[PDB]
Structure 1
Amino acid sequence: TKVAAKWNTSLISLFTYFREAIVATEPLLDILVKGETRIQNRVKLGLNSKMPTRFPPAVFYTPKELGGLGMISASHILIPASDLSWSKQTDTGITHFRADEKLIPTIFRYITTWE
């Protein structure tokens, strides 16, 4: 959680400051991509010695308060349709839901350009 928070701080610091300029500088973008991945992998490593095929993004990007890590993504992350299903136990029965495409929203859209 702490690590995630730190990452968020770093990312926010980068963006809130260089707002408009990050979109141009490709190297920085690449680093961000990779950095995020690295961060994710640390957590993965902690969880298990074997690295997973794929975690759900849920565990990372879901907020601190819901019980996630609350990473603030800087990448084209793909929330797989499989990882959006859910169920509900009721008196009537067990109503389900399953699943365009869903993408973890990136910090980019949410900081207003300096101009």
Structure 2
Amino acid sequence: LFTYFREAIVATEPLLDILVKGETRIQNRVKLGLNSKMPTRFPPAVFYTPKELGGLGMISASHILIPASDLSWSKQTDTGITHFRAGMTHEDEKLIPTIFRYITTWE
């Protein structure tokens, strides 16, 4: 997804939303295996920690503070980046880096 449209992701909010959702779903799959999904019992440690420290080693694009906007004025007319939405999880102020910042934008 990201290597194909590196630069072009940032603007599209729907895609971002999907990523957030998709990532969460994936996480829950793992948590489904462990028959819980209790949000404390899976700190981001267990997912994003690499396999070389025993983690799953996911490559998140979910911890981004998504651009929210006036959906009144978004589809209509014009736009600007104001009010960020949550992004994906409760964090312990643990800023998980995002794959996009390690991919050189197409231009």
Pick the TM interval, shorter chain: 0.5 to 0.7
- Please state how far the C-alpha of 1:35 moved relative to its aligned partner: 0.3
Contact persistence 1:77–1:103 (CA under 8 A): no
Q: Which residue of 1 aligns with 2:83?
A: 96
How many equivalent pairs are there? 102
Contact persistence 1:88–1:95 (CA under 8 A): no
Bigger-Rg structure (1/2)? 1
Worse-superposed segment, 46-55 or 87-96: 87-96
* Stretches of structure 2 lacking an aligned partner (at least 5 in a row): 87-91
Higher relative strand content: 1
- Please state how far the C-alpha of 1:78 moved relative to its aligned partner: 11
TM-score of the pair, normalised by structure 2: 0.67
Larger RCO (CA within 8 A; separation ≥ 6): 2
Worse-superposed segment, 47-56 or 80-89: 80-89
Cα RMSD for the two superposed structures: 14.5
* Stretches of structure 1 lacking an aligned partner (at least 5 in a row): 1-13
Contact persistence 1:33–1:75 (CA under 8 A): yes
Higher relative helix content: 1
